[PDB]
Amino acid sequence: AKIIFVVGGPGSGKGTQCEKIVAKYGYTHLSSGDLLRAEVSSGSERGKQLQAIMQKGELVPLDTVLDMIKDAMIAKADVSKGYLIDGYPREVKQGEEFEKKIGKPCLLLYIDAKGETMVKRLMKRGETSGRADDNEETIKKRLDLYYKATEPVIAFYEGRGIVRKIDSELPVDEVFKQVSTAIDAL
Numbered sequence: 001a002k003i004i005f006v007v008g009g010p011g012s013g014k015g016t017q018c019e020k021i022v023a024k025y026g027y028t029h030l031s032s033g034d035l036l037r038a039e040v041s042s043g044s045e046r047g048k049q050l051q052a053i054m055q056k057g058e059l060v061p062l063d064t065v066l067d068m069i070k071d072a073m074i075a076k077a078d079v080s081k082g083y084l085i086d087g088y089p090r091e092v093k094q095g096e097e098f099e100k101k102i103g104k105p106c107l108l109l110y111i112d113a114k115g116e117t118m119v120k121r122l123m124k125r126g127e128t129s130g131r132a133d134d135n136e137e138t139i140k141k142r143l144d145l146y147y148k149a150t151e152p153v154i155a156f157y158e159g160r161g162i163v164r165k166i167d168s169e170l171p172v173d174e175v176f177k178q179v180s181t182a183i184d185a186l
């Protein structure tokens, strides 16, 4: 099965575009954030540790996140012709371990938004839906961690030759036209 990585800053639009891909193309959307949140909601001790980390806007350890992604991919293996890995990898080492333990991606959709745009989007969502990490201080930390840890992922996969940059400043449907062009070109 094809493995597509979807990487971009917090609030850039990764989840939105992934849900569009699912509806049009039928790939399996796995979200690292949603997996981690599902553990938090289980009430486990592990979930309590993850909630603490996520609330602070820091990165969860690679071992826990990659486990859960692998767990989810195995659970869907029967029925998936492709996977969208949304929000993983977030550092170069995550990408390398994923390739060692699972397989190589065929495409990286780089969901590119401006920093100010991301702040605005996450503040709006936080005011609405109240996700715990959508508060101003945590937003700032998430964005700074993205620039520091995650942009080198984009460089790594530029070196591999598989990055397609998606202008996520446009309206949702215009972003998805770019996304669709990239996927149709595989």
Ligand SMILES: Nc1ncnc2c1ncn2[C@@H]1O[C@H](COP(=O)(O)OP(=O)(O)OP(=O)(O)OP(=O)(O)OP(=O)(O)OC[C@H]2O[C@@H](n3cnc4c(N)ncnc43)[C@H](O)[C@@H]2O)[C@@H](O)[C@H]1O
Binding pocket: 008, 009, 010, 011, 012, 013, 014, 015, 016, 017, 031, 032, 033, 034, 036, 053, 054, 055, 057, 058, 059, 060, 061, 062, 065, 086, 087, 088, 089, 090, 094, 121, 122, 125, 133, 142, 168, 169, 170, 171, 172, 175
């Ligand atoms: N691999 C990893 N390693 C270690 N730790 C990890 C990890 N993965 C996760 N974690 C941990 O878990 C935390 C959460 O990670 P995760 O949940 O993956 O959150 P994120 O990167 O913080 O993503 P969001 O879901 O905040 O953004 P999105 O880019 O999907 O934007 P969306 O489409 O929702 O859109 C945002 C909003 O904007 C709107 N919007 C989208 N596109 C547009 C558009 N084109 N125009 C106008 N509005 C738009 C949406 O409607 C919505 O309101 C991390 O901070 C970390 O602690």
